[PDB]
Symmetry: D2
């Protein structure tokens, strides 16, 4: 349904940064800098530019003060300056609204193209960026919970197959998905950089941003984030986890920022860079697909997500999913999940796992 | 109201082993050897004797085939042979039924006393045991989920202050407990060996054995047990966790064996060996007391536990707790918990967290 | 010196496998399977095919019985079948000997090109491979020392800049190097897959193979390998480490197989996939460049490496390095190393760090 | 030849704290607080009082400014106030100099006894101490290299059996030792608290203090301390390690403070609280006894140690060891070590393991 342009797709390297609108810059600074330990590349009264421990581009996260908390831009770095031209022609062919600024939208980025994409998301494509001191060996700064890289974005959208075809045309390769036996797709993960993903589509009402994810080196670094949150008596801002994912095989944690923006901490997925990387499809009723240990997924994880803005800074209208709901079919009143396919023992009827 | 005997208490070193009755020995062997990686000290068609990586006594766990799954004995090692005689005099004065076997009840244990204690639990006291190869440097045998020591037992009993005073008289020192402002005690942790505990009392219907706990070296060893259970498609046997405890500060996991005996995997609690070790009391409504990260405690954790046997091998009758229920006051319809004391944000009412 | 062909370079994905010749197959199997825990894809009386925990191609290591222990092939996977044709044309233009086998040189590989490259190394390029069960979530098999991926090769060659230019034309990008203030390059690291490297050049007499490297998930996995070697009373086969590298920032260990092939265990380097990834140059006299903690580099690490074979299976003759020796200028008799640039305190004159001298 | 007193020994709980004299209080503070992350209980211009993450007594380390860097006191906590009286009666019957202060020698300690013991060391015994906030759940403060407990002291003394007999009479139980086949003892480890040790004797010229040891939770915490020292460009202050010990089975690191006082970081030894805990005796020529991975022990580890003070604050005279030297018999020019007992393969003669000789 989204047509494949004649124009060549831009060569996209990876997810690079997100710009998030926040309502209280000081509260958000405390969360991202004092709790999570992200490093400040630049800040003033209106914005905070933050980067992970191993990054050399200017930033991985921009917090911009504004009236309505929302995603303003999800940015991907492209391989060459000429790929920004290619992006612009590609989205024009798709009949999408675009805006190009030779000196960038945010500090530390040069020539950049922002677009309202066919799923209603604000994508940015850029090459030029101000290099900063790469802190990868600054063990004098290293926190027990250190965030080392930006890993991926996750987007909520009502029609996953529609979105998947579009991202595949753009060069993303699907690595894992969740489907049922009746032709419904609930989620898909897709990559450029050779990890399990750079973005993912989660079926639900949208456009909304589900989360932004950062990596740590080791599993104990994620445990430390939880332990620190207990010590600060903000354990209520731990939403889900820590756990092992089924899809992706990564160790994970979901926490909530002061404006409820969801942040995932993630580590130790696998290499997907080969072009015949085997795709893995999970059944939606498999209770090890999201948490490998079978821990229940809290309904807020399925229902809550962040608003996204269009290029004028207004919130995008939400379009309702009409396909089956992953919440309803697994943990709702008529839901079902299994531990072992075909075994009644360890299955759950009309409720979540573990009691 | 259990009287302190005039006879001197035995000098208890530590928790040493449990004897669990299991209904299918082969299934049980799979779980404890093939899944959990415990080391075989002896086996035959009726029993399997198992030890942890760093143990030098004969075993930490005896699995005995029997008709009804139950705890048969929770055993403590005493300091000297003469302490077995002390234990016998002590429990006799308490009015308890005792049985002394000079050659032991199980293989690899010598002179031993088993008793039906004042709380209805089958306790064993022994000194003599057959030493075996201590495997602590056998990294050729080390598993990614390696269980390295036996850490503690946890007992369900209806009146916590009654049992606590009894265990204090026996020389156990309380390290942590959970109470409310009305003065109810819901749980207590107490030690001999200088860790947070050797045994613990959980308020509930009893006597029942809540769990036996083994320790690992590191947190990732516990993660691996979860990951392995996923791969074996037995994730339904993960009951609760993994988590960080409030009480004890240990990283933890609870899993269920084939007869629904609960095993805890545990690491990185703190030193309690000083006699004035500060005792920590948590409020029952504090949602970080059990899981520090505020994860909810599943009802089964409060309501399910193993039967225990008397010295004839019959199941001990159960006494209902009359004091307030921790389940009811925290996650029941009239329950509540808080993240920050006095703050409605982050509080849960008639509802568990998350 | 090595000219850039007009013919386009093949699109190389990653290092994929090495074929090592071994003298006693059972002894080598004991090391790679029983000690290190690699997974057997296939074996017979002549060869063992092994893969890492997360691999889905047929193998990462082939062990082949032969009279003389040596590297027979270092293999790189290319993006498409047509890239194997490109590789053949590209190396033919370079004037190199090449051999094309439509059904592969080893089991589990299809159409494959082997070349004697301009530096004397036996490279293989292929696309087609038999997929196997990817064991990445088989935690029922996971070892305390589990090797999860093949990471890189490291090659000993006398003229590092000559080889560096050749690999750059082939599309490898240099991520780090070691140089001095007098124009000498002692080593360079270069990648295709977006980690610090897929291969590396170490200055010395060559061609010889320095090592093949496998990665683990965490640092404790590497510690466990050491601990297990102690328990098996083969700690004499731990050559160097464990440590933190300066170059690459990875945690590491070097061990020696039964034929003295060196294997590295490696974890937690950083992302290099951006095309303007900053290139890091370390000075050869910086005592934190190889081991970040300043631990001395044992002389065998600089002097010993494996023979490599030509396409006929004969050993390649060794060409002597005439550029300065990293060993000699850092830990030799007239050597020098520093902890802090410009500070005499924490410097070493004519011996290694931490109170040691060359044996 | 130290007789067993008729007076009963005090009941000793554990090692509790050390008082180290340091020459520059600010530079020592940088090391212990800014580099190592210890927690300040009290400080002024003359002294800094430091504790570990899980401690509830007032301190584990007192840094006292003075002209000559040295150990001033190694303190053990006793079980009851009455045990301080017992310590006094015990050491008086041994004919040792004692000094008793009802209000303590350092802040946060009450009634305390210091003695110049039969081996020349300044021991303190106390019960009373000021309790402080136990930081064990303060994960808002927890550093990547967090030191969680004080674990042990290690003493250099010329005659190990003489010292060991005396400590056994004091209630310490030997867990491990190192000996040769001709009856020389090189080192012994001994405990009260149910870990491998609270103190240890290392054969050498003495009295000198070899080190004080702190524990971490996990192995990666020790790795971080090394990594941080590299980042701070003070890797020259990493003396030995990191490694796995043979004796004790603990993961370890040795670093040097600004006055060259040696600090060990240590984790994951085993339980010794049972009274028949099996001893382990290692052969001095076993190259896995100190480092299980066979890494060489730097000569400074055998030769260098801190001065100790008498009760007047003057340095104790040093007595030379007449028994054989562990350095000499293992890594010296006539030394040897083995990987496998009886096997020439993996053995080292007249040099250290891994390819080094003494610097
Ligand atoms: Ca020069
Ligand atoms: Cl998920
Ligand atoms: Cl709990
Ligand atoms: Cl290196
Ligand atoms: Cl040692
Ligand atoms: Mn995610
Ligand atoms: Mn427990
Ligand atoms: Mn390497
Ligand atoms: Mn020590």
């Amino acid at each position: 349904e989204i047509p494949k342009p004649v124009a060549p797709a831009p060569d996209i390297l990876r997810c690079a940064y997100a710009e998030l609108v926040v309502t209280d810059l000081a509260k958000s600074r405390n969360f991202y800098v004092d709790v999570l330990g992200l490093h400040v590349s630049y800040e003033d009264e209106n914005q905070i530019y933050l980067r992970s421990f191993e990054e050399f581009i200017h930033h991985n996260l921009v917090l911009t003060k504004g009236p309505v908390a929302a995603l303003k831009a999800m940015a991907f770095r492209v391989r060459t300056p000429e790929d920004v031209d290619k992006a612009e022609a590609y989205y024009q062919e798709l009949g999408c609204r675009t805006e190009r600024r030779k000196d960038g939208f945010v500090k530390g980025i040069g020539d950049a193209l922002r677009v309202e994409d066919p799923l209603g998301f604000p994508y940015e494509f850029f090459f030029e960026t101000t290099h900063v001191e790469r802190l990868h060996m600054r063990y004098d700064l290293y926190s027990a919970g250190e965030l080392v890289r930006l890993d991926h974005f996750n987007q909520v959208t009502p029609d996953v197959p529609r979105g998947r075809k579009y991202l595949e045309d753009l060069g993303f390769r699907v690595t894992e998905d969740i489907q049922d036996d009746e032709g419904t797709t609930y989620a898909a993960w897709m990559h450029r950089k050779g990890t399990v993903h750079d973005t993912a589509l989660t079926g639900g009402n949208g456009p909304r941003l589900h989360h932004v994810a950062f990596s740590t080196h080791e599993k104990h670094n994620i445990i430390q984030i939880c332990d620190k949150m207990g010590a600060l008596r903000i354990s209520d801002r731990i939403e889900r986890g820590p756990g092992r994912h089924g899809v992706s095989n990564a160790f994970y944690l979901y926490i909530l920022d002061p404006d409820n923006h969801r942040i995932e901490i993630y580590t130790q997925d696998y290499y997907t860079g080969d072009p015949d990387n085997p795709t893995i499809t999970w059944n939606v009723h498999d209770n090890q697909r999201r948490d490998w240990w079978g821990n229940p997924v809290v309904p807020s994880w399925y229902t809550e997500a962040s608003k996204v803005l269009d290029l004028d800074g207004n919130v995008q209208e939400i379009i309702e999913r009409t396909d089956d709901s992953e919440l309803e079919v697994t943990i709702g009143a008529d839901g079902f999940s299994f531990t072992r396919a075909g075994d009644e023992d360890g299955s759950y009827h009309g409720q979540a796992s573990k009691g």
